[PDB]
Each structure stands twice: as structure tokens, then as C-alpha cells.
Ligand binder design. Sequence first.
Ligand SMILES: *C/C=C(C)/C=C/C=C(C)/C=C/C1=C(C)CCCC1(C)C
Lengths: 133, 133
Amino acid sequence: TRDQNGTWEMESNENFEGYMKALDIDFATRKIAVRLTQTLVIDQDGDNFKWKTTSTFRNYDVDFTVGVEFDEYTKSLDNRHVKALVTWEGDVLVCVQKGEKENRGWKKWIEGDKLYLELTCGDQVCRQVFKKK
Amino acid sequence: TRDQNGTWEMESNENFEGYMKALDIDFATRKIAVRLTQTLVIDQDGDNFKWKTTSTFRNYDVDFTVGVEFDEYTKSLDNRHVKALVTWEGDVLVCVQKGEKENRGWKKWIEGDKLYLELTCGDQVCRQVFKKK
Ligand SMILES: *C/C=C(C)/C=C/C=C(C)/C=C/C1=C(C)CCCC1(C)C
């Protein structure tokens, strides 16, 4: 069939490094690229094609209910099992991840027009700020 | 302000690598992940809270028509300008990318429920297979 419509997810990718050197891509960029997965969405109207390719490194979704404990496996992150519980502290959403790591969790809150996020592990805190699209 | 719904786009990241090292994420994954853009999607429905973090390297769109040559910019790819002609050899979508690289193009086709793609440049051939996610 010539119908190539659809969202496609890459399943196999060989000699991608050799092809990348043929285009003179620098070695640091080639290191990133070989670990990336690729999604390719084709929108086809006969001989008229439009397709988009996105290259991602690590996807990670989660779905929970506030105030209900849930088991969480952090695959593609650190690959640990934790017993997670998320509660509101006023306007701050607070998550504790009980497991091997001490002080493991995050805090997420709206301030003005922006989302702030603080990830914590042990004595390390990562602070992140997002703007809404 | 507990409504955190939205598509959120990172504007700053503090101590991300220290956080990952606290998690024992290997050095190579930390080096890649810190060079990437992170997009956070939040679907919030009452007490049900779903978030989905995507870490993307590069994104690329194109629309064209079989039989028509067209100026093309491999934006976010290798970032070259080419003259691309996409034709049908049987039920195979073949492309030749004219420009300052010898023997550049690709071929794409369907068999069953899988998309086969071959990227060519110089003497290098890259083969990829996609599953219809
Ligand atoms: C409220 C939002 C939260 C808790 C999201 C946090 C995001 C992370 C823990 C991100 C983790 C990483 C990636 C998805 C990419 C690769 C590196 C990781 C594992 C640190």
C-alpha cells in the first residue's frame, strides 16, 4: 500500500552513526542521537504528504490520585520501586517517595504565571521553572 | 491556585546533574539528558493528577507533493538546504536531495503493519523500522 498515514514509533535503527558522519555531524551530537527514539507522524492526502519527526530521549508519565498511596517503578529513570504519596500543603503539591533514597520526592506549585518544581534526593535539590504554552 | 493544568515549557534548570547523580544515574545518561529540552504536560481532573514529561532532542516538519521538486531546509537535522524530488518507484516512496552532499536521499515503504525507511548519504546507508504506535 501507498497509504503511509499514521503515528509511527521507531523499532530498529542500524548504521545510524555511519550515516551521521557522512553528513559531518559532530561526535558529541552523534552521542546524543544514537540513544534517542524517534516518532514519525505522516499525514497523507494522495500524493500530498506532510510528516513530522520528533526525537526523544526519555518519556515518563504518571497517573495517581492525591492522597492515595501508589506503587511507582521509575523505569528509564533510576529503575527503582518506591511507595509514593502525593498531598496538598496549601497550594504546594507535595510528593514523598518512600524507598532506598532518603528525602526523595518533589514539590510543585503555581506562582504567578509559572510552574515551579523542586526535585529532591538526599541532600540534592533540583529547582525547575516552567512557563505555560 | 491548585489548577496546574497545561503544557509547560522549561525556562530554567538548577542542579539537575547533582540531582541525577544523587539518584546514581550513570554519567553518560546525565551528559545527554542535560543538553535536552524538557516539556511537561499536566492533565488534572479533580483529585486525579496525571503528568507526562517529554525530553526531546529535535523536531522537524515538512509538506511536499510527489512529482514536484521543492527547496527544503533540514532544520534541526543537519541544517542544510537542498532541492528535493520525491517520486514513486512502484509502491516505494523514494527521495533524492540535491545539494552539496553526494548521493543524498531516502526510501520509505510499508509492508504489513511496519514502516521501512532507508537513509542514504555518500557511501553510508541507514536502515530504520517503525511500528505503528
Ligand atoms: C511535577 C513533575 C515532576 C515530578 C517531574 C519530574 C521530572 C523528572 C524526575 C525527570 C527525569 C528525567 C528525565 C525524564 C529524562 C532523563 C533524566 C531524568 C531521569 C532525570
